Structure 1
Amino acid sequence: ATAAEIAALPRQKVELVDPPFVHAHSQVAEGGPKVVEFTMVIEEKKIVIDDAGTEVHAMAFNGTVPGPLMVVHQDDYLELTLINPETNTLMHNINFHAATGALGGGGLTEINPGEKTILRFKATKPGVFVYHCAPPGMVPWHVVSGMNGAIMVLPREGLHDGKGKALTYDKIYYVGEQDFYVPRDENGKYKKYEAPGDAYEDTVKVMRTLTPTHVVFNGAVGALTGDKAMTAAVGEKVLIVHSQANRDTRPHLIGGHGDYVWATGKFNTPPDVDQETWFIPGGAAGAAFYTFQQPGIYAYVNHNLIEAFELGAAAHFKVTGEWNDDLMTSVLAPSG
């Protein structure tokens, strides 16, 4: 497109919503390319990440960890207004793995506190992609401080299996997995700091051990458990988008499966099927499609079980409906 062609395209302002939920969107594109407008503010703030009051200075897109999922269609133009409040203390930018050029947009979006920038790029490749902050010289630090999220570039005609048949989801949830590296004093307790910059040196030391202290979904242990469990019903088709901007993960739905899984997160690559556990390398997003068949509670975990049940990477799905004794049945309940 020429400058004149792009400016003439229909435009749409989308109001982002907090994860695990996703803003309203149509799976199958209606009409020609559009310029889709998103606005995100950067918030540097303290968040508690576990039941023991552990705090961390998060650098979050729209104040959440992970940042919100943005959805557009292949060949749409994503036009983002990124604002860095005069209230913040660090420079930030954004790098879309979905984009082409200038370090994913990082080289054109360096904004200091009190500045804003508007970046536009054409979403040429379909799939789910990671996006994260990446300021020269401080890349890992901003990412493992929670400054990352994902976008989804849906094919114009919606999703399809390898065979080429349509896959329509009833619900979609976005699970952002985050590895945190919280420094511990000489006595084992987690340290606290006044400002982000004060925790840098100590945090880098933990990072170099490549061993995270916490691995959580939606920014905190238990964030998606109990009453904040994701929901579904027997018969419902669910797309679960999962991202990890820095470290490997291996999602597993306990009691379920990944009927169709784009483990690489790219829609032009046929999905693997009937997966028990899939693998998403650090720096990538993936997606799993599943149709619930049994009611009850399910757990959704990173299957290095130590990371899931000790470090925090576990979420719940509460599913309603009728039990199917054909798929599974207790012939003899536990008995003497």
Structure 2
Amino acid sequence: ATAAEIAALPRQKVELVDPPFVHAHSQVAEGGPKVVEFTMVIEEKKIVIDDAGTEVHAMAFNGTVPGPLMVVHQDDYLELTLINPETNTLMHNIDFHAATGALGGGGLTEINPGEKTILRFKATKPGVFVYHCAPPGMVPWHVVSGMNGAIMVLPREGLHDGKGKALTYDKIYYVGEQDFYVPRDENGKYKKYEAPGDAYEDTVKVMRTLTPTHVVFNGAVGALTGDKAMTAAVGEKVLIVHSQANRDTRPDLIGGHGDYVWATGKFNTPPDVDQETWFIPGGAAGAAFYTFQQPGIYAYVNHNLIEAFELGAAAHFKVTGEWNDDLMTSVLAPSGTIE
């Protein structure tokens, strides 16, 4: 398309919402291609990632970890206004794996504190894609400090299964998984720092052991458990978007399954079906579609159970509805053996 053609396309401004929720959108595209505008501010701030008061200097898109999920349709243009406040201390940029050229946009979006930039790219490929900050020479540090998220480029005709059958979800949640590498003092206690830069050296040596100290969903251990559990009802169709910008993960819905899973996250690649545990390599986003059949609590985890229950990668789903005894029943409840 020529510049004049792109300029005459209708524009839509979107208000981003905090994860795990997603901004309003239509699954089946309404009309022709559009220019969809998003605005994100970068916040460098301290966040507590566990119940022991462990602090980390996060670098967050819109103040959250992960950054929000942006949704567009194939062949729409995504136009991002990215702002780095004058109160921040580092240069940041953004690389959209959904984009083509200039290191995903990272080469055209380097902004220092007090600057802003506007980048536009055509969403030519459908699927879920990771986006993350990637400043030359400090790439892994910004990513493992939480500066990453994901976008979803829906096919214009909505989601479909392997054989053309339409798949419409009632709800969608975005689970961003993050590996943190927090330094510990000579006593095995987590260290705290005044400013982001002061933690760099120590963090890098923890990073080189390739063993995270924490692995969490939505920025903190237990962030999506208890009162913050994700919800659904029996009969509802849910799409769960999962991203990991740096490290492998293996999602599994305990008590349920992955009816249709685009483990690689690309909609033109047929989904795998009836999955128990799927695999998302570091540097990618994946999506699973499931229709709940039983009520109760479900645990959604990284199925390396140590990472899930010892490091923090575990979330809850609270589902309402009626129990189905055909699918599962307790014939004899736990009781003492009668001698």
Q: CA deviation at 1:131?
A: 0.0
The corresponding residue for 2:206 is 206
Task: Supply the distance in 2 between the matched residues of 1:119 and 1:163 (Cα, whole angstroms).
Answer: 36
Q: CA deviation at 1:101?
A: 0.2
After superposition, what is the alpha-carbon deviation per residue over 1:303-330, rounded to whole angstroms, capped at 9, x for unaligned? 0000000000000000000000000000
Residue 60 of structure 1: SS of its match in structure 2?
strand
Residue 192 of structure 1: SS of its match in structure 2?
coil
Task: Supply the distance in 1 between the matched residues of 2:39 and 2:299 (Cα, whole angstroms).
Answer: 33
Q: CA deviation at 1:59?
A: 0.1
Q: CA deviation at 1:142?
A: 0.1
Task: Supply the distance in 2 between the matched residues of 1:30 and 1:16 (Cα, whole angstroms).
Answer: 19
Residue 91 of structure 2: SS of its match in structure 1?
coil
Residue 204 of structure 2: SS of its match in structure 1?
helix
Residue 108 of structure 1: SS of its match in structure 2?
coil
Task: Supply the distance in 2 between the matched residues of 1:166 and 1:46 (Cα, whole angstroms).
Answer: 43
After superposition, what is the alpha-carbon deviation per residue over 1:238-288, rounded to whole angstroms, capped at 9, x for unaligned? 000000000000000000000000000000000000000000000000000
Task: Supply the distance in 2 between the matched residues of 1:29 and 1:114 (Cα, whole angstroms).
Answer: 36
- The question of 1:46 aligning with 2:46 is answered yes
The corresponding residue for 2:168 is 168
Q: CA deviation at 1:221?
A: 0.1
Q: CA deviation at 1:51?
A: 0.3
After superposition, what is the alpha-carbon deviation per residue over 1:17-58, rounded to whole angstroms, capped at 9, x for unaligned? 000000000000011000000000000000000000000000
Task: Supply the distance in 1 between the matched residues of 2:260 and 2:32 (Cα, whole angstroms).
Answer: 28
Percent identity for Structure 1 against Structure 2 = 99
After superposition, what is the alpha-carbon deviation per residue over 1:109-164, rounded to whole angstroms, capped at 9, x for unaligned? 00000000000000000000000000000000000000000000000000000011
Q: CA deviation at 1:291?
A: 0.2
Task: Supply the distance in 2 between the matched residues of 1:174 and 1:291 (Cα, whole angstroms).
Answer: 17
Task: Supply the distance in 1 between the matched residues of 2:164 and 2:313 (Cα, whole angstroms).
Answer: 34
Task: Supply the distance in 2 between the matched residues of 1:93 and 1:206 (Cα, whole angstroms).
Answer: 24
Q: CA deviation at 1:231?
A: 0.1
Task: Supply the distance in 2 between the matched residues of 1:68 and 1:8 (Cα, whole angstroms).
Answer: 28
Q: CA deviation at 1:175?
A: 0.1
Q: CA deviation at 1:66?
A: 0.1
Q: CA deviation at 1:230?
A: 0.1
Residue 197 of structure 2: SS of its match in structure 1?
helix
The corresponding residue for 2:177 is 177
The normalised TM-score by structure 2 is 0.99
Task: Supply the distance in 2 between the matched residues of 1:2 and 1:37 (Cα, whole angstroms).
Answer: 19
Q: CA deviation at 1:186?
A: 0.4
- Write out the 4+ residue segments of structure 1 that deviate beyond 6 Å after TM superposition: none
Residue 187 of structure 2: SS of its match in structure 1?
coil
Residue 25 of structure 1: SS of its match in structure 2?
coil
Task: Supply the distance in 2 between the matched residues of 1:168 and 1:32 (Cα, whole angstroms).
Answer: 20
Q: CA deviation at 1:296?
A: 0.2
Task: Supply the distance in 1 between the matched residues of 2:297 and 2:123 (Cα, whole angstroms).
Answer: 37
Residue 142 of structure 1: SS of its match in structure 2?
helix
Residue 105 of structure 2: SS of its match in structure 1?
helix
Task: Supply the distance in 1 between the matched residues of 2:270 and 2:113 (Cα, whole angstroms).
Answer: 43
Residue 160 of structure 1: SS of its match in structure 2?
coil
Unaligned runs of 5+ in 2: none
Q: CA deviation at 1:292?
A: 0.2
Q: CA deviation at 1:300?
A: 0.2
Q: CA deviation at 1:195?
A: 0.2
Task: Supply the distance in 1 between the matched residues of 2:330 and 2:95 (Cα, whole angstroms).
Answer: 51
How many pairs are equivalent?
336
Task: Supply the distance in 2 between the matched residues of 1:108 and 1:164 (Cα, whole angstroms).
Answer: 38
The normalised TM-score by structure 1 is 1.00
Residue 106 of structure 2: SS of its match in structure 1?
helix
Residue 140 of structure 1: SS of its match in structure 2?
helix
